[PDB]
Every structure is written in C-alpha cells, then in structure tokens.
C-alpha cells in the first residue's frame, strides 16, 4: 500500500453529524461488521490457482518428452525384431529344401528357454 488515503462517510459544512457517526462507525469497525460486508461484495469466485509454483524443479512438463522417444525407441525395436526373424527364415528356407512352414518352426525353436 503506497498511499493511505481512506474513504469516509461525508458530513456537510461544519455540522455535528460527524460526531454521531464517528462514534457509531467505530462500533462497526471493531466488532465484525466491516469484514462481514467487505467479504460480501469483494468475494468473487474464490478462484484457486497455479498450485503456486513448481519453479524449475523439473517434472513431466519439461523432460517428459524423452518418454516419447523412449516409447518411440522401443517400437522400432519390435518392428525390426520381426525383420531379423524374417531375414534368417528367408535364408534358411533357401538352404535345405522347405518353405515358410519351417519359419514357424523357427519360432517353435526360439520360444524355448535358455539352451
């Protein structure tokens, strides 16, 4: 508060109407009345906001995009895991005699445990 002006119940050119009010307005000022009415028109929405500040304490809002590229970096692992599995199955079908039915048998071999 830069300035300390203050409002006031006005009173005409010199008159004792100021004396009955300055008494009576201090009873409203000290009991509760200028806080029960100030919070009756200056209330508003009562808006809660911002949870005030995180303020450079890094969360998900800044470095959360690496969990995009970690998600994108595992999608290109699964689609190439098919690609290595198709590359040797195309090679091994050329070798002995047989077709792509043994490529499923190559899945039947590699579905086993530690050999």
Ligand X SMILES: CCCCCCCC/C=C\CCCCCCCC(=O)O[C@@H](COC(=O)CCCCCCCCCCCCCCC)COP(=O)([O-])OCC[N+](C)(C)C
Which residues sit at the interface with ligand X, rule CB under 6 A? 60, 64, 67-76, 78-80, 83-84, 87
Per-residue interface string for the shown chain with another protein, residues 79-108, x marking contact by CB under 8 A? -xx-xxx-xx-----------------x--
Q: In this chain, which of 73, 90, 100, 104 binds another protein, going by CB under 8 A?
A: 73
Tell me the DSSP string of 38-71: HHHHS-TT----TTS---S---HHHHTTHHHHHH
Q: For the chain, how are helix, strand and coil distributed in percent, rounded to 5?
A: 55, 0, 45
Kindly state the tokens that stand for 22: 């300055």
- Residue 17 makes contact with another protein by CB under 8 A: no
Kindly state the smallest distance separating residue 97's Cβ from another protein, in Å.
20
């Amino acid at each position: 508060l830069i300035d300390s002006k203050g409002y006031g119940v006005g009173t005409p050119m010199g008159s004792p109407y100021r004396d009955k009010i300055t008494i009576a307005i201090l009873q409203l000022q000290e009991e509760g009345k200028l806080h029960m009415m100030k919070e009756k028109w200056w209330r508003g929405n009562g808006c809660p906001e911002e949870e005030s500040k995180e303020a450079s304490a890094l969360g998900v809002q800044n470095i959360g995009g690496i969990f995009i590229v970690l998600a994108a970096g595992l999608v290109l692992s699964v689609f190439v895991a098919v690609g290595e599995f198709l590359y040797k199955s195309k090679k091994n079908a050329q070798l002995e005699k047989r077709s792509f039915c043994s490529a499923m048998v190559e899945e039947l071999r590699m579905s086993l445990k530690c050999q």
